[PDB]
Design a protein around this ligand. Structure first.
Ligand SMILES: *[C@@H]1O[C@H](CO[C@@H]2O[C@@H](C)[C@@H](O)[C@@H](O)[C@@H]2O)[C@@H](O[C@@H]2O[C@H](CO)[C@@H](O)[C@H](O)[C@H]2NC(C)=O)[C@H](O)[C@H]1NC(C)=O
Ligand SMILES: *[C@@H]1O[C@H](CO[C@@H]2O[C@@H](C)[C@@H](O)[C@@H](O)[C@@H]2O)[C@@H](O[C@@H]2O[C@H](CO)[C@@H](O)[C@H](O)[C@H]2NC(C)=O)[C@H](O)[C@H]1NC(C)=O
Ligand SMILES: *[C@@H]1O[C@H](CO[C@@H]2O[C@@H](C)[C@@H](O)[C@@H](O)[C@@H]2O)[C@@H](O[C@@H]2O[C@H](CO)[C@@H](O)[C@H](O)[C@H]2NC(C)=O)[C@H](O)[C@H]1NC(C)=O
Ligand SMILES: *[C@@H]1O[C@H](CO)[C@@H](O)[C@H](O)[C@H]1NC(C)=O
Ligand SMILES: *[C@@H]1O[C@H](CO)[C@@H](O)[C@H](O)[C@H]1NC(C)=O
Ligand SMILES: *[C@@H]1O[C@H](CO)[C@@H](O)[C@H](O)[C@H]1NC(C)=O
Ligand SMILES: *[C@@H]1O[C@H](CO)[C@@H](O)[C@H](O)[C@H]1NC(C)=O
Ligand SMILES: *[C@@H]1O[C@H](CO)[C@@H](O)[C@H](O)[C@H]1NC(C)=O
Ligand SMILES: *[C@@H]1O[C@H](CO)[C@@H](O)[C@H](O)[C@H]1NC(C)=O
Ligand SMILES: *[C@@H]1O[C@H](CO)[C@@H](O)[C@H](O)[C@H]1NC(C)=O
Ligand SMILES: *[C@@H]1O[C@H](CO)[C@@H](O)[C@H](O)[C@H]1NC(C)=O
Ligand SMILES: *[C@@H]1O[C@H](CO)[C@@H](O)[C@H](O)[C@H]1NC(C)=O
Ligand SMILES: *[C@@H]1O[C@H](CO)[C@@H](O)[C@H](O)[C@H]1NC(C)=O
Ligand SMILES: *[C@@H]1O[C@H](CO)[C@@H](O)[C@H](O)[C@H]1NC(C)=O
Lengths: 316, 156, 111, 122, 316, 156, 147, 316
């Protein structure tokens, strides 16, 4: 009857708790551990690659980030770890990390010109430039906001209300300029003491400039602290300000809202498609696990910080 | 471990591929490797269910989500990275211990099934023949191809 | 910097009337940390020079409130609102931006 | 309440070296640059040199060749040593405390706040 | 003689790794899959079922939420997902989430009138009403705080110190009103620039109104930013203000402190007792697990998100 | 695994109610099943201690606590949600894996209790009874109930 | 129940009984394999647990009560699941280290019939005899496994 | 012959899933249940034991915590649960917990005199003393910051810029004094409306006092809110002020930044070296686990709350 069992030629092996490198007959690998090493399309839609650009620089419209004026739909945003262009004039964006958290759930913006430059009869709209934000060598400024300056030795009170007639949320961006000294303000904003009051159904702000001496960053000692809000349908934002106002020009309709992420990597993009993606490379595979990178997007295997998983499906 | 993977079956045959167990044949008519269909199919179904359970029961595994934090929020950034690393560590431990326990329970499942098809033969055989260690069940009487095939039928 | 040109050489003005001394420079007096680095001094007929104002417009310790500076870059101006007696004396503008410190030419401010 | 006082002769030959010394009372020569000043009869104020309390000296380029400034923290004194006294160098020499301390790291400025009573030289 | 094993008619099916739906003789279910469907008293102490009311509305004394003027001892507070009656006048409660966290440990408040209406001689207290907080159709206002409106076209500088002579912590609530324009300030307080200085052994607050234009929430364009604090025994709180002061009237002495939670459920109270409670029904079982809801309170089984969790305590 | 339950003995035997792991009295004097109370008591003690162990190790399990966050602080709220979901997922994994890993080891421990009880009789007769294939034993000298009580009592 | 207190060398062994001697010693092979397996078991148990969570002390002020509770519950939950994991393997690998340790106590008394067929009776508590009348040499070969 | 297994007299007992007390031949205890009970030197570097002192009191230079004027390198800071000497004057250090978090990564401070007291010609530096911070009974004040007070009944506008010429980060501490009342404000500073404007490449801070009524903690009703920043190499901080300025005098240079922790324990110090340390007491062992306390430091065993983790390395 000669009871027994077979044995193949494969040299592959598994491991157990009491023994390791046990040679086996057939075994099933469950770890992919390979990637294309290129950013790829995710289910047909290409990502938003912000090359030498940042989320703040993109959204505020940095003059050195010009290829994102009519961005189409995407699935994930790719950014470098230390982008070159971000807030070209020195300053900050309040709740930047929260704005990025909300952009992680947004798949498409359509920028709409909400406040045309014809809506500033009594102020300058073509003099708020600086050498910290050059364009083609000549000075320039953020294109999605307008730095307003005195017209004829005067800065009249700016009271404008924008009602969100659209059927989608609007990401409205403004800011406050922090001047160096009283002389600099009086050169720019005639009123010595100024403010920016902002009101909405669910927001209340009263911003005052901090006229102080600061370090020279990018050749500039003033600081533009930018602010953002999301305005719901049938909700209106009320801007009052007598100075230091970095007014909105373009808002952003949130047209499509879904699943996304900010990838935070600088791998070169190849023309390719995948179901799963990681910052270092894509994953075309049906393995239950992977070990390429923790942060992933799409129908992916499950990350495991290891280098050898294998199920002993064979006899020995 | 149940033994007979390295026990009374000292070696291992070289007959057939894709069947994880089997008999071997020897008589006046010839030889061959016709696998025990019942035990081999049982093991294939069982290990298929094992792999299916392994992949199914770890489908709700933790999915890390990138979160950025400000320079003056290093406590919460430390909290986030330690949370994510601890979840990755417990899930890595789970996978690496379930693949180090369901690999020795599989190696010993196949060992149990290897010895189980031996003592079934002895059980049906009883006193009319005498078993040897290497795997051969030697017979005082003469079984032809059909009478030996009765043992592989399961109706001896 | 090297040349500090003080425009009046003798400012005539009566008591109870605003005065405006001026002092141009041949270089922008602005320190790297946004400080004007101009100093206004008064020399009375007998006593040594006295600091009135430093760093553009910052009053000194023991000086009356009538004195006040203004200006940035190169154009600078001292202002004496009350111009009461004992303000008679030669007023100087000094630059401390660079190592060649330079006082301006005097203005007598005749009573 | 820091007080500065000059010391030195009035009559000077037109070929030999002048020597003045400025003594400070109420506080030591500790933390500021100390500057010598000269004003001719009328005309306008002009500065000869200034010496840091450590010893670093910066002199006027016009007077660079002949000047030498010193300091003595132990005696709370600092001196001026105009060599080759020309007839132009006949004036009233004042003594001020610059009170700037614009070193490599710390920067501030209070001007020539404290002025000693000048001494005539001819 | 023969040998065998027990068998019976039971079709108890268990699961293993190798096989599923394995029929066995006996099996013990370790998962409770049923709930009472009602909110039950936890160990006899009836919960605080805030019907259409919020924690902020109950604590500030919303005019609609007058059912809870006198609250006996409870075991857990129950709230709806989106209560209608919450901050009837528009505004916000600073650190609302922290206050709700601290009420998860408080099993009883005793309301004490700390500052009578007789404690405002030179101010108006009976005109502090609004249409956004109606009571029986007529306008009303939060009952635990007082809107101090000017008297005789004048607003004397409030200066009142309350000393915690009690032996228990006192939860004190006040607020600051934010007006639409300076004309509204003049018509309510007769002071263009106002402040509210609050001091304690640990608190140092200077609130200033943000007079701005905002949207019409509930018909009102003003905003009451409410603030809270906890006053320890032998500690005193010092209020000072020349305007915009929504002063305390009642405080909430923390008598009994223990274990509780802020449940979010719309389930009807059932007039029933339990040892464990869930936001979808009292469990009341001795089984080790339950798959009913993550959040529970009491001596509860441990939650597991599974549909079949059975131990094979019998033979095949 | 040990291949006795649904093994050499094919089917269970209804009418065995005094205890698991019983016997069939079969002689000319009488008949009727009887229970091996020793192995039954050992099995019930083992299973009881096992169930006690699973309920004890699953005590001090993660208890989700409700928390609220404002319109901002969304990343911290997401961190809390993901932490609670991750602890729920790993504890669900632990429960759903320990039931399965202790249902196969329980149903094979029942298989153990039968295979090392077919051997308590094989070594207690030892060629004095023609042990057959189904699983019962046929005495050469038919023990009466007095003698056949020894194998249940383990005396001989 | 069985075992013999007289032997000192080795976890698993034999007993001897013949006219020329009764003192008795162990198997080097089976005992070496058992000790190797147990050593690998201990090594793997410690190695899999070197990536365990390490609590870090984070401080929070009086108005971060809920974030402090979040940190406390996270730390205690990771500690609880790792306590569960360690207690579960000293409860599971211990049962398996007494069931493997019983398998290689049953795979040896049958070895003298499973590898030297029809030699003798199986008796009780793992005791096995020899039918053939023989001196030291066959006993020592059975010890060696070369017969 | 006979076949069997080894036995002995060992009373070692083991937990198993179906049996909770199993007498085994040998067992390897993998849990260390003992500690030395006294603080030891982690790898030869003795800790910074702030005896009856806090991080705030040490960093700001409390007069009672004058034993730490010069601090050598430390492996870990040790603080008691409730230090008595901590911010002797009433107040609060802003971002105290973040400062402790950053300090947990720092292994050495080289305190340097960045702003000598001779840098204040027009303000009093020797009258900034209070009885809340006594030294040898007599009144005193924090040693690393100077409380500047009016001179000649005047307070000229402070304007000082410090540029980091070192190759290491500088932790610079200042503060703002919140006065008791307006008459106290003019008695100390001769300026009703004061400010402190601090500027850096990143920091743009303005601090206005809060003149209000508070409680008598430590016998004073004024509150010194202290602030800190980290200044990078070739980066300059710019202080401007006209009152309430608690100016820096000493700043800590971050000269060695490795690994550390702020351990909380009142355990005494033993003149002993260790390799793993715990708040209760050091662990000189090499077992896989310990059950002493959750928080440890150094190459330590892993913490498990169990009381008996024993692995069966034997039979029976
Ligand atoms: C923002 O606009 C809405 C809607 O305004 C009306 O409908 C628009 C399409 C357009 O035709 C406008 O001219 C209309 O006035 C405002 O909602 C109105 O609010 C008032 C308040 O009294 C109410 O009487 C109207 O019935 C509302 N109309 C509708 C259609 O809702 C809203 O107030 C505006 N401001 C805000 C707060 O967003
Ligand atoms: C809050 O009140 C306590 C209790 O004492 C009250 O005040 C006394 C002056 C007197 O009126 C008693 O009847 C009151 O019960 C105060 O404690 C006293 O504080 C004073 C200084 O203000 C001190 O001299 C006393 O020794 C303290 N007495 C006791 C028994 O401790 C406390 O100061 C008040 N706290 C504030 C206003 O913050
Ligand atoms: C901090 O100082 C550096 C160095 O300043 C120079 O060296 C000092 C010792 C002193 O002599 C200064 O006057 C010198 O300027 C500054 O770096 C320089 O910045 C200036 C002005 O922008 C620039 O022209 C130089 O090229 C810079 N030099 C180098 C070597 O980088 C630095 O800017 C100061 N920090 C800040 C925040 O302003
Ligand atoms: C295995 O490989 C060898 C060469 O290594 C080859 O000759 C042989 O045919 C293969 N098959 C078997 C059954 O050995
Ligand atoms: C198994 O083999 C690999 C590859 O040669 C080697 O790196 C590893 O150390 C081996 N493991 C053991 C336990 O021998
Ligand atoms: C991904 O793999 C699938 C099969 O799983 C294949 O059909 C497809 O072409 C692959 N895509 C790319 C871009 O390689
Ligand atoms: C038994 O063997 C015969 C041989 O003719 C075969 O036809 C039959 O199918 C076998 N029976 C079973 C149940 O497999
Ligand atoms: C199983 O069902 C049969 C058929 O009805 C019955 O005779 C027997 O008693 C049942 N056994 C039980 C309940 O154990
Ligand atoms: C097991 O029984 C369940 C009962 O719901 C059924 O859904 C399932 O299909 C059955 N089979 C398997 C393999 O799970
Ligand atoms: C809960 O279960 C206990 C125990 O069976 C019982 O006494 C009680 O009536 C049940 N019902 C409720 C509502 O507590
Ligand atoms: C029951 O077992 C005991 C213990 O071995 C024995 O003394 C007794 O004789 C047995 N009973 C019978 C009836 O054989
Ligand atoms: C065990 O105890 C017995 C009885 O006292 C003794 O003879 C024997 O030497 C002991 N064995 C060991 C290993 O201690
Ligand atoms: C096991 O023994 C210990 C003492 O070593 C005792 O505390 C414990 O209760 C015992 N366990 C059982 C189940 O009897
Ligand atoms: C501490 O551990 C070292 C080895 O790291 C050892 O030599 C020394 O004896 C131990 N001391 C104590 C007191 O345990």
């Amino acid at each position: 009857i000669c009871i027994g069992y077979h044995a193949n030629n494969s040299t592959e092996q598994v491991d157990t708790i009491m023994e390791k490198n046990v040679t086996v007959t057939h075994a099933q690998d469950i770890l992919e551990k390979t990637h294309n090493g290129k950013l790829c399309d995710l289910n047909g839609v290409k990502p938003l690659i912000l090359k030498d650009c940042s989320v703040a620089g993109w959204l505020l419209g940095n003059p050195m980030c010009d290829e994102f004026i009519r961005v189409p739909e995407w699935s994930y945003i790719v950014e470098r770890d230390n982008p070159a262009n971000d807030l070209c004039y020195p300053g900050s964006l309040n709740d930047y990390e929260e704005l990025k958290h909300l952009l992680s759930r947004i798949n498409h913006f359509e920028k709409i010109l909400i406040i045309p430059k014809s809506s500033w009869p009594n102020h300058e709209t073509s003099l708020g430039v600086s050498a910290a934000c050059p364009y083609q060598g000549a000075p320039s400024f953020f294109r999605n906001v307008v730095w307003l300056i005195k017209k004829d030795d005067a800065y009249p009170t700016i009271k404008i209300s924008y009602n969100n007639t659209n059927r989608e949320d609007l990401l409205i961006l403004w800011g406050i300029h922090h001047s160096n000294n009283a002389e600099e303000q009086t050169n720019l904003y005639k009123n010595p003491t100024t403010y920016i009051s902002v009101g909405t159904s669910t927001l209340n702000q009263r911003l005052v400039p901090k006229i102080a001496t600061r370090s020279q960053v990018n050749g500039q000692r003033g600081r533009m602290d930018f602010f953002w809000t999301i305005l719901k349908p049938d909700d209106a934002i009320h801007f009052e300000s007598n100075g230091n106002f970095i007014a909105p020009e373009y808002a952003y309709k949130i047209v499509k809202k879904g699943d996304s992420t900010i990838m935070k990597s600088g791998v070169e993009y190849g023309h390719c498609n995948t179901k799963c993606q990681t910052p270092v490379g894509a994953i075309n595979s049906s393995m239950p696990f992977h070990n390429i990178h923790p942060l992933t997007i799409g129908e992916c295997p499950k990350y495991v910080k290891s280098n050898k998983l294998v199920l002993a499906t064979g006899l020995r | 471990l149940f033994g007979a993977i390295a026990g009374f079956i000292e070696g291992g045959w070289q007959g057939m591929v894709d069947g994880w167990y089997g008999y071997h044949h020897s008589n006046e008519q010839g030889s061959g490797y016709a696998a025990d269909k019942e035990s081999t199919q049982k093991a294939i179904d069982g290990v298929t269910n094992k792999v299916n359970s392994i992949i199914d029961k770890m489908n709700t595994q933790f999915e890390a989500v990138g979160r950025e934090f400000n320079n003056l929020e290093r406590r919460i950034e430390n909290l986030n990275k330690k949370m994510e690393d601890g979840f990755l560590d417990v899930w890595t431990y789970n996978a690496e211990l379930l693949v180090l326990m369901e690999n020795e329970r599989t190696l010993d499942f196949h060992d149990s099934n290897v010895k189980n098809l031996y003592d079934k033969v002895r059980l049906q055989l009883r006193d009319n023949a005498k078993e040897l260690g290497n795997g051969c069940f030697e017979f005082y009487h003469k079984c032809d191809n059909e009478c030996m095939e009765s043992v592989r039928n399961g109706t001896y | 910097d090297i040349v500090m040109t003080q425009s009046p050489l003798s400012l005539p003005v009566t008591p109870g009337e605003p005065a405006s001394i001026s002092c141009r420079s041949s270089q922008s007096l602005l320190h790297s940390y946004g400080y004007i680095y101009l100093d206004w001094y008064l020399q009375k007929p007998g006593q040594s020079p006295q600091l009135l104002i430093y760093l553009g417009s910052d009053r000194a310790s023991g000086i009356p409130d009538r004195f006040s500076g203004s200006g940035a870059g190169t154009d600078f101006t001292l202002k004496i609102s009350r111009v009461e007696a004992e303000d008679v004396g030669v007023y100087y503008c000094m630059q401390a931006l660079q190592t060649p410190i330079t006082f301006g030419q005097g203005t007598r401010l005749e009573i | 309440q820091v007080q500065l006082q000059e010391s030195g002769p009035g009559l000077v030959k037109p070929s030999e070296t002048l020597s003045l010394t400025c003594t400070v009372s109420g506080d030591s020569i500790s933390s500021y640059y100390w500057s010598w000043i000269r004003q001719p009869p009328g005309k306008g104020l002009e500065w000869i040199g200034y010496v840091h309390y450590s010893g670093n000296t910066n002199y006027n380029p016009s007077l660079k060749s002949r000047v030498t400034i010193s300091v003595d923290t132990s005696k709370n004194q600092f001196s001026l040593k105009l060599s080759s006294v020309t007839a132009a160098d006949t004036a009233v020499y004042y003594c001020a405390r610059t009170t700037m301390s614009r070193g490599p790291s710390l920067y501030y400025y209070y001007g020539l706040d404290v002025w000693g009573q000048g001494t005539t030289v001819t």
